[PDB]
């Protein structure tokens, strides 16, 4: 990946989102979209959204992932790394991060992830996984 995909260019799918992590008023989700650039039906686009309704702000957010040897994964820089405390008057804020996934051989996608973030005096370290991906043949038809 010298290849980037600007946010502006992504057309959302009709696939439901998938909740990756949900704790401490902090939530990560995957939205899946067809690769908007023609000529690569073996790339999944994963719009990662990170949302907070925590009473304190959330800082130092890093999201990482890994994928089977046979496929690759790239993470474009996130829109940001912190979130404001919940405020009833303002609109909720989101961090967005684009995540690219190359599956030439077209096998079942699994994904591990690490999430580090800070909230007050506390740091959090999560490691887990995701397997609710759209079947790899469908990656052109969404």
């Amino acid at each position: 990946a010298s290849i980037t995909v600007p946010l502006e260019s992504i057309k959302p799918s009709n696939i439901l989102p998938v909740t990756v992590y949900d704790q401490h008023g902090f939530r990560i989700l995957f939205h899946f979209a067809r690769d908007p650039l023609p000529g690569r039906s073996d790339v999944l686009v994963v719009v990662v959204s990170m949302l907070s309704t925590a009473p304190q702000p959330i800082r130092n957010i890093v999201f990482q992932s890994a994928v089977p040897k046979v496929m690759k994964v790239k993470l474009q820089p996130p829109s940001g790394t912190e979130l404001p405390a919940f405020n009833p008057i303002v609109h909720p804020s989101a961090i967005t991060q684009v995540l690219l996934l190359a599956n030439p051989q077209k096998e079942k996608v699994r994904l591990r992830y690490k999430l580090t973030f800070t909230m007050g005096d506390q740091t959090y370290n999560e490691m887990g996984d995701v397997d609710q991906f759209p079947p790899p043949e469908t990656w052109g038809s969404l």
Partner: peptide
């Protein structure tokens, strides 16, 4: 199918 290394973004 064993896993690759963890990737992150250029900070």
């Amino acid at each position: 199918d064993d896993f690759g290394g963890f990737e992150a973004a250029e900070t």
